Design an enzyme around this catalytic site. Structure first.
Site, short mmCIF file in Angstrom:
data_model
loop_
_atom_site.label_atom_id
_atom_site.label_comp_id
_atom_site.label_asym_id
_atom_site.label_seq_id
_atom_site.Cartn_x
_atom_site.Cartn_y
_atom_site.Cartn_z
N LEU A 12 -0.34 -2.70 54.98
CA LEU A 12 0.92 -3.43 54.76
C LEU A 12 1.74 -2.92 53.57
O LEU A 12 2.87 -2.45 53.75
CB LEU A 12 0.64 -4.93 54.61
CG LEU A 12 -0.35 -5.53 55.61
CD1 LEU A 12 -0.46 -7.03 55.38
CD2 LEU A 12 0.03 -5.24 57.05
N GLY A 13 1.18 -3.01 52.36
CA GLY A 13 1.87 -2.60 51.13
C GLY A 13 0.91 -1.90 50.17
O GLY A 13 -0.11 -2.47 49.79
N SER A 14 1.20 -0.64 49.86
CA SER A 14 0.31 0.11 49.01
C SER A 14 0.87 0.49 47.68
O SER A 14 1.82 1.23 47.56
CB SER A 14 -0.17 1.37 49.72
OG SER A 14 -0.46 1.11 51.08
N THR A 15 -4.42 -0.40 51.15
CA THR A 15 -4.70 -1.06 49.91
C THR A 15 -4.43 -2.56 50.06
O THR A 15 -4.99 -3.38 49.38
CB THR A 15 -3.88 -0.43 48.78
OG1 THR A 15 -4.76 0.09 47.78
CG2 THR A 15 -2.94 -1.48 48.19
N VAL A 16 -3.54 -2.91 50.97
CA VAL A 16 -3.43 -4.25 51.47
C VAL A 16 -3.48 -4.22 52.95
O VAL A 16 -2.62 -3.68 53.56
CB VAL A 16 -2.11 -4.83 51.11
CG1 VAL A 16 -2.21 -6.32 51.10
CG2 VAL A 16 -1.74 -4.30 49.74
N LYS A 33 -6.17 -7.51 49.42
CA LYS A 33 -5.83 -6.53 48.39
C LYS A 33 -7.08 -5.74 48.01
O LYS A 33 -7.96 -6.25 47.31
CB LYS A 33 -5.26 -7.25 47.16
CG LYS A 33 -4.81 -6.33 46.04
CD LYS A 33 -4.05 -7.10 44.98
CE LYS A 33 -3.45 -6.15 43.95
NZ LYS A 33 -2.73 -6.87 42.87
N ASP A 121 6.58 -12.19 36.79
CA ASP A 121 7.04 -11.25 37.77
C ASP A 121 7.67 -12.01 38.91
O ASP A 121 7.42 -11.75 40.03
CB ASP A 121 5.89 -10.34 38.24
CG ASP A 121 6.38 -9.07 38.89
OD1 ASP A 121 7.56 -8.80 38.89
OD2 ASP A 121 5.59 -8.35 39.44
#
Length: 259
Positions: A12-14, A15-16, A33, A121
Site C-alpha cells: 500500500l504505502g512504502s 512495508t505496509v 506496518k 504530524d
C-alpha cells in the site's frame, strides 16, 4: 503480542500490506506496518507503545505487535485511504460531508488532548477514511506522551503544518496540534490540495511572521475559514484548544444538518 500463524498477509504505502488476523471466529482485515532491518526498532515500538494507550472511535486502533520474520505493527484497516487523496478524486463531496469529517478529526484530537498526547504530524494525509462519513487519525510515529507536570514536549519536519513556536522554540503541545488541524481543514476544503504551494519552509515561516495566512478555499463556508484563522493564532497562549475547536465545529455542523 500477536500470533504469527493467525496472520495472513497479501503493498500500500512504502512495508505496509493488507492482511487478515483470525480473531476468535471472525477474520479481521488489517493494515500491517512491516519494518525492515539500526534503532528503527525502538521507533516502531514507541509508536506501538503510544497506540496501545489510545482507545477512541476517531483514532486508528492497534491490534497488536507481531514479532516474526519481520517486526510488524498490526492495525485496523481504513479501506478508503488518506483524506487528501480521497478528496482529490471525489470533487462531488459536499461541504456538509467535509464539515462532518473534520469534526470527527476534532473529536479524536479533543480525546488526544485529554489523554495528554501530542500527535506532531497532523495532516490530511494522516486522516484515513473508513467510509465517506467516517474518518480516523493515523500515524503516531512522531507522537509523544506529555509528562504529568508539563503541557509541551521539547524536541525531517512537515514545517507547513508546524506552528511558529515549534519552528522558533521546538515546543510541541496540543495547541501546536491545533495549528496543524487548521492546515488540515484548509487541505480538506481545498479537496486535498497541498498547502503553501511552491514555497520552501523558510518562505512559509516568513509569510506567517508577516501575519499572512492562506486564503479561503473555493466554496468553503465562511464560518469554517474563520475557524482555520483561529487555529492559526500566532500566540500559543491565545490559540484555542481542541475543546473549543471541537465545540465550534459541532455547533456549526448541527446548524448545517438541522437546516
Amino acid at each position: 503480542y500477536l500470533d504469527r500463524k493467525l496472520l495472513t498477509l497479501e503493498e500500500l504505502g512504502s512495508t505496509v500490506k493488507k492482511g487478515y488476523y483470525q480473531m476468535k471466529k471472525v477474520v479481521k482485515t488489517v493494515a500491517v506496518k512491516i519494518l525492515k532491518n539500526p534503532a528503527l526498532k525502538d521507533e516502531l515500538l514507541a509508536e506501538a507503545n503510544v497506540m496501545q494507550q489510545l482507545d477512541n472511535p476517531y483514532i486508528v486502533r492497534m491490534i497488536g505487535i507481531c514479532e516474526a520474520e519481520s517486526w510488524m505493527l498490526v492495525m485496523e484497516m481504513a479501506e478508503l485511504g488518506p483524506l487528501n487523496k480521497y478528496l482529490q478524486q471525489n470533487r462531488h463531496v459536499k461541504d456538509k460531508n467535509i464539515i462532518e469529517l473534520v469534526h470527527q478529526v476534532s473529536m479524536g484530537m479533543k480525546y488526544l488532548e485529554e489523554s495528554n498526547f501530542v500527535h506532531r504530524d497532523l495532516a490530511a494525509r494522516n486522516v484515513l477514511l473508513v467510509t465517506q462519513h467516517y474518518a480516523k487519525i493515523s500515524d503516531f510515529g512522531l507522537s509523544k506522551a506529555l509528562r504529568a507536570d508539563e503541557n509541551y514536549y521539547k524536541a525531517k519536519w512537515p514545517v507547513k503544518w508546524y506552528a511558529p513556536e515549534c519552528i522558533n522554540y521546538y515546543k510541541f503541545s496540543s495547541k501546536s496540534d491545533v495549528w496543524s488541524f487548521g492546515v488540515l481543514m484548509w487541505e480538506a476544503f481545498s479537496y486535498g490540495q497541498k498547502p503553501y504551494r511552491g514555497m520552501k519552509g523558510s518562505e512559509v515561516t516568513a509569510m506567517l511572521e508577516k501575519g499572512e495566512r492562506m486564503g479561503c478555499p473555493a466554496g468553503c463556508p465562511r464560518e469554517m475559514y474563520d475557524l482555520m484563522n483561529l487555529c492559526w493564532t500566532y500566540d500559543v497562549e491565545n490559540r484555542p484548544g481542541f475543546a473549543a475547536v471541537e465545540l465550534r465545529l459541532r455547533n456549526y455542523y448541527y446548524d448545517v444538518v438541522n437546516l
